[PDB]
C-alpha cells in the first residue's frame, strides 16, 4: 500500500502517455514474478507429520497402469458384459 | 432379378444424394416441408412403396479385401456387401387435425394474402412437430391422450427408444460393479463425480462404444439439448479476461448441434446421415369439414411414416447425465 | 384516406419501416396472431372405438385490445410564419418538420407510458407518460413472466453476474421460448447508459446475436426479441385534421386526432430486463 | 435399390468409396502376405500386404 | 506449491479442452484477488516512529 | 488422437500437423507427402 | 488540452469528444453541433 501511494505521485511514471501502465498492475506483476521465482527454485521437503504420514506421491504398489482393463467406466462396462458372456458360456463346463 | 430389375442391371453392366421415385402429391409435400427447416435438410426422408420390408443401407462401410491361395486349395468366398445388425422396419400412420373458429377466420379473411400465411404456418407447425415427436416418444399407443404427455411422447417409437430396446450395450445409463449392480443411478459429472467434465465423457464414449470403422470418420456429430450446452459454456464466459469460442461450440473434439425439445439429460453421438425417416409413397389423405355445431371449420390429415436409424453400430447415446460438485 | 398518411409516415422514419403497423376495421376484438401453437399430432383407435377429435389452433389466453384516441395540437405565431416563408423552401421545410416531430413522438410514446389518464400535462411528465400503455409497460402489466428484477441486479464484478454477455446468455437461455430461441431475427436492443464501445447497427454482437439502439428507451434496460413481434393497430378511418386561423391571439392553430393502440403479437418470443446498473463491490 | 432412380450411380460411388478407403486402411497397417487372410482375427487389414509403417520397421 | 501439485492432477480440472487454463495462472489470479481485496479495504495508520 | 484430411493450424515442432483417416494412434511419422507411393 | 477538427474515438461520457482550434482549455461545453449559428 505504501509502494502504491508512492507510485501514484505524478513524478513517478518513467514512461510517457504511451504504455503508462497503472501502478497497481506494475507492483502486482513485480510481486508475482518475485514470488514465482521463489516457488520455482524451491522444493518440498518431507519433515511434516500430516504430509509424511500417508501422502506424497500417488501410491506405492504394483498395479497402477499395466493391466487397467477397466479404467474408464465405458471400457469397464464393455469388459463386464464380455465377462458375463464368458461366464454364461463356461457354465456349460465345471 | 425381377423383370424391370434384371433389365436395369443388364443395362448397367453393358443430385445423387436424395431419392425420388415418381412425381406425386405426397412426395412433393414432404419435399416442401423439408425445405422449410434446416435440420430436416441434413437428414434422409425416404419414400418407400411397401408396408414392411428391409431398410436401405446408407453410409455403411467395412473391410472387404482379402487374399486367398486359389492355386490348389481353398476357394474364394465373398463377404456380404450390406449386412447390418437388424433390419426390419414397420411403417404406420399418424395424423394431426386442427380447427379454426369462425371469429378468427372472419378476422383473418379481411387482410389479403391469408391463405399463403396459413399454409406456411401449418407447414412450420408440422415440421417441428415431426422433430419433437421423433426424438421423444418411447412407445406408440392408440387413442393417444395429450393431458399427461405434453412433450408428445406417445405417438410412435423414436430413435432413442430404438437404441434402448433394439440394441442395448450401445447405451450407458449407470455405473456398476461386479457386486454393485447399481453403484450410482445417474452418471454424475463434476469435480468429484464419475468424470472430469463432459469432454472426457464424450471422448471415452466415442473411444469405447462405437465401432472402429465409423470411429475414424470426417462426419460425426454430438447431438445434445440446450440446457446441457449452456451449463457447459456458461462458467467459461462468466469470467474476467478470446470470445470466438461461442461461434463453433465444439465439445470433446467433435462439432455439436442442438435441436429443440431434445431431452436435457442425454446426448447422442453419431453421424448426421445415419438416422432417417421413411414414409409411404401415397398415404397423405386430407379432408375438410364445416360443422357449425361448435361453429368451427376443422380438417383431418393423415400420413404413414416410420423413424429408423440405419446402422445401430454407428452411434451411441448416454442417458441420465447430472452435473454437480459431489464433495 | 388515413392509410396514405400512415404509409408516408412509416416511410419517412427508418425505424418504423422495420416494424409493422396495421389498420383495424373494428374497435375491440381478437388480435391478428399467426403464432406457433403447441403440439397437434396424435393417434386414435378409429376402427371400432373412440372418435377422432381435433385440437384447437391459435388458442387464446388474453388477447383483448381496445384502441384509444390520441391527439396533438399546434400553435404557430404569426411573427414566425413569414420567416420560414422567406427562405425559398417554406412548404418542404414545414412538412418535413411536422412529420418528423410526429413520427418521433409515436416512438417516444411507444417505449413509455404506464396508464391512460386523460387530461395529461407536460409539466410533471417530460417523456410523455400518462398518454397510453406501451410495450415495456404492457409486459409488466399482464403475465409478468418475462420481467427480470432480482435485489437490484449487478453486472459489475462482485455482483450476480460478471459481464452483460453472461446476462444476455442467461436471458436468452432461460426466459425466451426454446423453439424461438434460434431465429435469424432475434435482436437485442439496448439503451444509452449500458453501451461501452458497441436506428444504429453496431459492429460487435453481444451473446451471439446483433445489437442495435433506437431513438429512445427507458433509463437503463434491454429488450431481446424479434423486430416483428410488436406492432401498432390504428383505426381505419379515424384521423381528423383541421386548421383554424384565429387572430384573437395573433396565431394559427392546427388540431389533429387519431385512434391507435400498441400491442405485442406473440408475447412469448421476447424478453426484457430492467434495473441494470454497472456497479461492482 | 432398383426401385428408385439412378441406383447404378449410387452403387458405383459406394463401391469406389469402399475401395479407396480400404487401400489407405491397408497402407499404414499390414505386416505379412499370408495366403488366407481371415478377416475375423484381424479386424484391421493386417494380413493383406506390407505397409509403409512395416517397410520402415523392416528394411531400415 | 502444494496447491499447484494438487491442481496438476488430471482429475482436478473441471473445465474441458476449451479454457483449460494452467493451474499456475489460476492460483496466481486467486492470490492476486485475495490480496487486492485486503489492500483495498485496509488503510494506513500513523503508529510508527 | 494426440491432437478427407484436415491440417492443424498450430505447428507442433514448427512443422504443420495432419491427421490421416486410419492410423495406429500410439505412433507417428515425420516425412514429406510426395515421399510415399503405390505402384499398380 | 485535457485530451480543422479531429474526433477522439474513445467517448468520455458515452459521447464522442471533439476539439475546436481555439478554446479556453480550462472549460468545456456539451451540446450538439447544429445548435450554434452565426447570422450575417
Residue numbers in the entry:
A (entry chain E): 148 to 241
B (entry chain b): 1 to 14, 27 to 253, 261 to 346
C (entry chain c): 37 to 186, 197 to 244, 263 to 345
D (entry chain D): 120 to 179
E (entry chain e): 148 to 196
F (entry chain D), G (entry chain d): 239 to 241, 262 to 298
What's the paper's own text on this?
P4 procapsids were generated by E. coli co-expression of gpN, Sid and a protease-deficient form of gpO [O(S107A)], purified on sucrose gradients, and prepared for cryo-EM by standard methods. The remaining particles were refined with an expanded soft mask and without symmetry averaging, resulting in an asymmetric reconstruction of the P4 procapsid at a resolution of 4.19 Å (FSC = 0.143). The P4 procapsid is organized on a T = 4 lattice, resulting in four copies of gpN in the icosahedral asymmetric unit, here denoted by subscripts A–D (and A2–D2 for the second asymmetric unit). The gpNA (green) subunits form the pentamers at the icosahedral fivefold symmetry axes, while two copies each of gpNB (yellow), gpNC (red) and gpND (blue) form the hexamer at the icosahedral twofold axis. gpN has the expected canonical HK97-like phage capsid protein fold, consisting of an N-arm, an E-loop, a P-domain and an A-domain. Sixty copies of Sid form a dodecahedral cage surrounding the P4 procapsid, interacting with the underlying capsid shell only at the hexamers, and forming trimeric connections at the icosahedral threefold axes. Sid is a highly elongated (126 Å), aliform structure, consisting of five extended α-helices interspersed by loops, the longest of which (residues 189–219) contains an additional short helix. Residues 139–189 form an extensive dimerization interface that includes helices α3 and α4, where the two monomers of Sid interlock in a knot-like structure overlaying the two-fold symmetry axis. Each Sid monomer forms two sets of contacts with the procapsid, exclusively interacting with the two gpNB subunits in each hexamer. In this way, each copy of Sid in the dimer binds to both gpNB subunits in a hexamer, forming a bridge that straddles the hexamer. Therefore, Sid must induce the arrangement of hexamers seen in the T = 4 lattice by forming these trimeric interactions, thus redirecting procapsid assembly towards the smaller architecture suitable only for packaging of the P4 genome.
P2 procapsids are assembled from pentamers and hexamers of the major capsid protein, gpN on a T = 7 dextro icosahedral lattice, together with the internal scaffolding protein, gpO, and a dodecamer of the portal protein (traditionally called “connector”), gpQ, at a single, unique capsid vertex. “Satellite” phage P4 is not a true phage, but rather a “pirate” mobile genetic element (MGE) —an integrative plasmid that has acquired the ability to utilize a “helper” phage, such as P2, for its own propagation. However, the Sid (“Size determination”) protein encoded by P4 changes the P2 capsid from its normal 60 nm diameter, T = 7 organization to a 45 nm capsid with T = 4 architecture. The smaller capsid fits the 11.6 kb P4 genome, but is too small to package the 33.6 kb P2 genome, thereby leading to strong suppression of P2 burst size.
